[PDB]
Subunit: 211 residues, 5 copies
């Protein structure tokens, strides 16, 4: 009862200390670059449209980064080791699919988890329409498509993009989807664009699937 | 007149809680009323439900003595002015659509009641819907970022309220249940909790 | 010049927490049915375009026009005053607003708010291709206020059909609007709704 | 250098001017309304909806927005987000979907106090397209007026009764045989007051 | 490494200082016009609908301009040469498509990059339905359609519109699209409208395309 509110007080003090008694992280820079880790969990291939060459994917995008300005010692705060916060209240990376054909639709609350070492985990579930030719989807070899994800405005010198893991997480894939996944990989690459001198980094998701 | 000033004073006293923690966990009670299965799509394996999701919780920081506030026992408030649980369907295929105003009722004991009516599109293979046994589909609900140690889910009953179900729907309900379940991953040490909505239905 | 200053003065002087059991509010509801746009026998949704007239009066919005350059009415954004949370109880999509979200406040404290809306709602259209046509119902009322806080009334039980689109695919045989009180399982308090009953055919 | 002084004159103007609550019976307003019909996208005979893209030209004048260009570096016009000023609540009276806005919600103010706001919009409205595959084509109408202001607070006029057809898409699926816009005054059953609208009448057929 | 740590601390401090300095330009005028450079990269023709004569495109729209009020010396700010800002925090040109049939849908974060010389780069990826007759698309010479982009409320005497090439960039065009691009050009034009006396300027995007 009284312990309960002391617990609420500790968490309010921690959020107020982090968000008001110190400047908020303004984003990475060439001199203070930020490593962002990216992982994908494929939940469902909803639809493959061979008349427009678009395919609709439900998936979770795991994003992790780590910030000194979000560190704290649990001993000073009632041994709290995590807290949740609205993703809008903090800096988040601008990860963007580079071949979507519709705005991404958000299916989960936009809430980040901050742990006392300053690491942030943000995992939005989304529905994504992207460019994909499903020719071959009704064959044993299936069809193969790809879509890559990376910052839109930060170079590879500002956001250092990495995959958490080599393997796409298929463990939550909808068993009764119209489409089975034959394989999926996620791979970092560097690339230059015509507009710009600076090098950019993306993670390429390649998926082989079939009916 | 005096009534109105008491209600305003009460809101100011309350409004001028940071979420549940492991040391101060919150019990949120969930209940579903199923109003309609609008549509079942066998080309994409998506089914569309209209339901009311009853949510209830209780916070010491929302309690007040009615005697000190004109004997006021409830008030209405925008869901955006108070903390609310992040209950999410775990297998929707479209953003859930809200069909009712985003207003909660707070009662003097600190209990909150919030009942959004929603249209949900979710992952469901409707094969067998045109047979006697129908099709069977399932969708889990629970917090997106809180574990069973911060947000404790429960139901008052395993029976989905079917008393309001649209009598001329394309699809009739054969059974609909809502079961709390506690799960442990070996990845992680904490308990996790969801309410599994299982619907058996077939064409009328 | 002097009137603009009066109007600005009036609004600043006026600028209510919503109704309560001690201070209940009567809200008057009426419907003008514009069009039955579409009937979908594959999902049993039907789409209506209608006007929803809402009316209520508040002492805290009363003024004497002679104290304010003889102003008798003004316009305000519906977001700047309390409005009733009238909800369609059997929609299948979020209702789509078709008109500006503005109310008119009159010096006696009455407020008039008339949103034009497009609604999809649960409705089986079998029979629509016959002489007797199909019948469907949709009820409207506060979502969170009991009949002890919002007292729902109509001026008439007949839906205004005088604006009904003469070249709609569907003709209105009849349309009624009726107040009723409802108990729900969740809640001890009684709720009040207006039930819209419409018989229509191709 | 002089360009920095010009930016300061603009900021001074916007600041001064922004230090009007809408029209009333004692201070009414006449809004000029015209339509630039761009395209009939779609006629649906299974619901009797038709989809237009058009430009809706709105023009009004307020003394409180007048200024002398001599005082402000000869600036004659500035731009402002349409949310930061009063704009009329012109509404189609028989749309079946929310109007979709296609152009930026920015208005233009001129030193004589005139305001021009011209949203490009896509509208679905109640229209029976029967006859559109014949030589006579189909005729449909949809009227535009204030929702909440009577003729004595907002009046309308048109500069012409002919709709501007000079931007009409020449490869549309539908060709326009005529398009008029005509002011009327009307009463409704809810309300004592007289409302004003401009009725847009369009005769069209398949190309 | 203690040095390495507060090197990072001072970098963040320099970035916030620079942003505070710059934020603590009201648009162009006839006396102080602004030149905007406009260029398109075409990513995909998604869909051509011959029943409504609408076609859907995914492209990048590159907008560039330069302001003296956005200049700074890096030496005074820890050698910072760029920063990111929400496009809502700065003035941006109201470049609009003139024949869209649906609200244009943005696909990229609404963020601009500002560089120490005062130039701003803003590149929204967009999906667009515009008026287009796809007759011919099932033929060797394909179909030809055009959509023009430019300010909606600023005349050519306020926003001076310019390309820095006539060729639409096709190096990112989706190679497995339903449609192949035969050619794509971007060309500035001036024009007068019935409403208004002032002259307006835009960039016309002409695309010739056919079924793959
Ligand atoms: C030159 N400079 C330092 C300003 C960089 O400003 C930009 C602002 N917005 C988008 C981009 N890009 C657009 C494509 C998609 N994102 C990766 C590439 C190519 C960069 C660049
Ligand atoms: C019990 N109490 C004093 C607080 C009531 O809290 C509520 C909050 N939100 C919605 C409802 N309702 C949902 C259904 C639709 N509306 C009419 C009924 C049934 C009430 C009730
Ligand atoms: C009496 N009085 C001063 C209150 C008028 O307040 C109103 C508020 N909202 C809408 C309307 N109307 C809606 C329909 C469409 N517009 C013209 C008619 C019919 C009026 C009137
Ligand atoms: C005359 N004057 C100084 C006020 C001009 O104010 C305007 C405000 N909003 C839009 C426009 N236009 C709309 C069409 C699209 N853009 C090019 C033309 C035609 C201008 C003009």
């Amino acid at each position: 009862d009284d312990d309960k509110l002391h617990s609420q007080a500790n968490l309010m003090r921690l959020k107020s200390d982090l968000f008001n008694r110190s400047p908020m992280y303004p984003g990475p820079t060439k001199d203070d670059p930020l490593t962002v880790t990216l992982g994908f969990t494929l939940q469902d291939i909803v639809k493959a449209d061979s008349s427009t060459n678009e395919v609709d994917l439900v998936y979770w995008e795991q994003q992790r980064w780590k910030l000194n300005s979000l560190m704290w010692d649990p001993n000073e705060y009632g041994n709290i080791t995590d807290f949740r916060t609205s993703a809008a209240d903090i800096w988040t990376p601008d990860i963007t699919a580079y071949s979507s054909t519709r705005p991404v639709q958000v299916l989960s609350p936009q809430i980040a988890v901050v742990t006392h070492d300053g690491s942030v985990m943000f995992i939005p579930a989304q529905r994504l329409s992207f460019m994909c030719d499903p020719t071959g989807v009704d064959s044993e070899e299936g069809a193969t498509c790809a879509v890559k994800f990376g910052s839109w405005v930060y170079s590879g010198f500002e956001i250092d993009l990495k995959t958490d893991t080599d393997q796409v997480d298929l463990s939550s894939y909808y068993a009764s989807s119209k489409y089975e996944i034959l394989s999926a990989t996620q791979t970092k690459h560097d690339i230059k664009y015509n507009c710009c001198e600076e090098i950019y980094t993306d993670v390429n998701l390649v998926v082989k699937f079939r009916e």
